[PDB]
Amino acid sequence: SRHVFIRTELSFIKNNVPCIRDMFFIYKRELYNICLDDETHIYVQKKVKDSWITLNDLFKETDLTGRPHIFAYVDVEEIIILLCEDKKDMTCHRFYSNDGKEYNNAEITISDYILKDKLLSSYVSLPLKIENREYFLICGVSPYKFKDDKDDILCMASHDKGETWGTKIVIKYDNYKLGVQYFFLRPYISKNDLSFHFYVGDNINNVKNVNFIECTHEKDLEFVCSNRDFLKDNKVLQDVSTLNDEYIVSYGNDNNFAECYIFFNNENSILIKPGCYGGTFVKIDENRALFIYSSSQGIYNIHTIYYANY
C-alpha cells in the first residue's frame, strides 16, 4: 500500500416530506430515494442541487391498504420496484421504468410462495449475476426458531426482470441461532458476490447487534454463508460496504450514536460528528461512496467519500 488517497466532502440535502423509512440508490449518476409518507404515500424522489424533488407517487396507482413492502431493483437501463402487501399467494405490484420520472404499472402475483413464514423487509439491490443469468432476489429470514430442524434464510429469484419468481436460491447459514430474534435481512450484492446484513437480538444485554455474513458459490444456485467479524470494543457496528476491493465499515460510539466513525480496510479512519443514527452507505462507483443520515427532521447530511489504495 504505497499510495493511499482519502477525501470526504460534506453536503446537506433538505426534504419537505417526512419519510418514515428511507431507501437510497444511484442510477445514471444521479441520487434517488424511495420515501414512505404516512393518507399513505410512496414518493420516488431524485436529488437535484440541494433538495429532494418528488417525481411520482406510485402508491396511488394500486390503492393498497397500509404500508407495503418495497423491493427496488436498479439496473443499468431500467428500474423495477415491487410493492407487496404486508394469503397463500404473495400479492405484489411490479413497476417498470427506463427513465426515472415515469413508471409503467403492472400487477403481479406469486403462487405458493416460499416466504410465508420468513420475515421479509425492504431494500434496494442490483441483479445477481450467476454465469450468464441475472437474478432479482426477494429474501427472507425466519424471525425466530425455538428448536432445530434447514432453510433459515432463503431467497426467491427471478431471471425475467421480476415477472416470474419461480427460481429459488438456497442460503446455507450454519450459524443461525436458536431462541434469538432476527430483524432486518437485506442482501448486499457488491460485484457479483452475495452478502447479507441483518440484525440479531442479544437477550441478555437486550440489544440488536448487526451481523454481516459473506456468501460463497457452493452450487450453481446454492450458497454457503459464514459470519464476518467486524466487532471492535466500545463501538457498535452499523453498516458495511466495499471500496477498492476492501471493506469500509461504519461504527457508532455507543447505542446512542452521538458520533459515527468510518474505517477503511480496518486501518484508516474518519470521524463524523454533527445524532448520526440510521446512516447508510450508497456506493457510487468502485472508489467512491456516500454516507447518508438525517441529524434532524427534514434534512440529510450526505458524506461523499473517495478511497484509493495502489
Author numbering: 1 to 38, 45 to 92, 99 to 161, 164 to 288, 297 to 332
Question: Mind quoting what the paper says about this structure?
Answer:
PfRh5 forms a complex with cysteine-rich protective antigen (CyRPA) and P. falciparum Rh5 interacting protein (PfRipr). The PfRh5/CyRPA/PfRipr complex plays an essential role for invasion of P. falciparum into human erythrocytes through binding the receptor basigin. CyRPA displays a canonical six-bladed β-propeller fold, and the inhibitory monoclonal is shown to block formation of the PfRh5/CyRPA complex. Within the β-propeller structure are four intra-sheet disulfide bonds (Cys19-Cys35, Cys90-Cys92, Cys151-Cys169 and Cys229-Cys239) and one inter-sheet disulfide bond (Cys274-Cys298).
To provide a structural basis for understanding the function of this complex and its components we have determined the structure of CyRPA in its free form. Crystals were also obtained of uncomplexed CyRPA; this structure was determined by molecular replacement, using the CyRPA component of the Fab-complexed structure as a search model, and subsequently refined using diffraction data to 3.09 Å resolution. The crystal of uncomplexed CyRPA contains four copies of the protein in the crystallographic asymmetric unit, arranged with approximate 222-point group symmetry. Within this tetramer, a pairwise association of CyRPA molecules is mediated by the formation of two eight-strand anti-parallel β-sheets, one (termed sheet ‘6–6’) comprises two copies of the sixth β-sheet of the CyRPA monomer and the second (termed sheet ‘5–5’) comprises two copies of the (adjacent) fifth β-sheet of the CyRPA monomer. In each case, formation of the eight-stranded sheet is mediated by the respective outermost strands of the two constituent four-stranded sheets. These dimers of CyRPA monomers then associate with each other via the formation of a β-sandwich comprising sheet 6–6 of one CyRPA dimer and sheet 6–6 of the second CyRPA dimer. The monomer-monomer interfaces, although extensive, are most likely an artefact of crystallization, as we find no evidence for higher-order association upon SEC of CyRPA. However, we cannot rule out such associations occurring within the hetero-complexes formed by CyRPA and its partner proteins on the surface of the merozoite. The closest structural homologue to CyRPA is the attachment glycoprotein of a henipah virus which binds to ephrinB2 and is important for host cell entry; however, it also has some similarity to bacterial and viral sialidases all of which have a six-bladed β-propeller fold. CyRPA lacks some of the important amino acid motifs required for it to be an active sialidase, and the recombinant form of the protein did not have sialidase activity suggesting it is only distantly related to these enzymes.
